[PDB]
């Protein structure tokens with residue numbers, strides 16, 4: 001979970017009257033002292049509702065260490081250790097067997113480079129990246145009882161690096177290259193394409209990963225390691241890196257041993273499952289939402305991407321609104337989405353899905369892998385509350401849920417036992433997330449670089465709203481919608497309505513949600 005770290009950050013910022021609080025910054029180095037520690041403790045007790053003391057701040061003076069302290073799980077330890085498929089990976093493999101996802105669970109990473117890179121040096125750099133991170137060369141075979149991992153040696157890991165000439169626009173080409181299917185049993189879950197053309201000034205570097213090997217949080221380590229490996233091979237040298245604290249299989253083995261078995265009543269898995277069974281009781285099968293077409297018998301996973309650019313003034317107003325009411329920016333976006341669905345006639349019981357990153361352990365905080373568990377955040381909007389009252393409801397719902405974020409979502413589905421159907425995702429069909437793209441990626445590969453948005457031809461749910469920060473000040477709302485249900489114009493209107501909800505909430509949080 002990251003919400004604790006963000007809350008401690010804004011409490012640091014407010015108490016210090018300071019606007020450069022990072023996760024690893026020391027409280028006393030930023031200008032804090034003993035008297036100011038009282039305000040940090042008091043504010044963290046009122047916001048997180050956990051017993052915090054002055055001693056906790058002195059022993060854990062950074063927002064990352066303090067957040068971890070405030071939340072018995074063994075640390076990740078290293079282990080030719082055999083690969084261990086995490087429950088995320090098994091569930092991601094499973095969704096490709098249940099549905100034809102059309103590449104919806106491929107994650108893209110597109111970087112425009114002012115110079116056309118050297119394909120041979122790039123291929124060598126990718127081989128080094130694949131050799132460093134075992135999860136990028138871990139195959140998944142379908143056996144009798146399900147998935148079985150196969151780790152390829154670096155010499156046997158045949159990388160997929162190629163140059164593609166773009167006659168067409170270039171943004172449409174990225175969509176289609178992203179959705180190209182992976183054969184998880186034979187091909188490594190990483191494809192690399194270099195797009196050049198007469199309309200492409202320089203080149204566009206596209207990293208297509210299957211989610212089984214990487215989440216959106218892996219963008220920073222992927223780019224950093226690929227940059228250092230490219231600049232080393234360009235200089236005729238193997239990259240010289242500090243060894244990895246752990247591979248993904250180390251994290252997976254540690255997590256599953258600590259999770260325990262669902263039959264053990266005292267295991268963390270069972271105790272968290274019992275919470276979700278009660279928290280998700282009498283859940284709506286599906287929210288009644290106005291769609292352009294009725295739900296088809298099978299979710300085709302066809303989709304589009306509607307974007308809403310946010311003005312910098314609104315982004316800061318959202319930041320100010322979050323710090324004002326003691327909630328994270330995600331909680332404001334999640335409350336705004338709930339208001340939007342409520343005003344569309346969905347009712348007072350709004351279950352929204354949301355990803356929660358399991359990157360608290362410092363050995364996996366900056367590593368490549370999939371750490372996003374899916375949680376059902378069930379917010380109630382009865383009693384015609386104000387947006388401020390809703391922000392308090394959302395925080396109470398989120399913090400209670402974030403304390404049980406380790407139960408695998410597939411196990412949660414199995415315990416809640418909703419009416420199953422391949423026409424819809426279970427327990428929720430609208431997901432909301434807050435994402436931050438990597439910062440300081442403007443001067444990579446010895447050139448000028450910038451992340452490029454990839455329009456998607458796929459969708460995982462009915463609706464997926466993401467508050468995406470680009471890493472260099474800007475922010476925008478992305479709505480990944482199912483084309484089976486919504487036309488592109490309807491999605492564009494939906495995301496513009498979400499921005500209006502936020503603008504109205506920042507202006508006056510005392511207005512009723514109705």
Ligand SMILES: *P(=O)(O)OCC(C)(C)[C@@H](O)C(=O)NCCC(=O)NCCNC(=O)[C@@H](N)CC(C)C
Pocket residue numbers: 032033034035
């Ligand atoms: P943070 O680390 O920034 O601040 C710590 C703080 C507030 C400086 C405390 O450590 C603190 O208050 N230190 C001073 C404590 C102190 O000096 N107590 C003695 C006060 N004098 C007496 O009590 C009196 N009996 C002296 C006798 C005559 C020896």
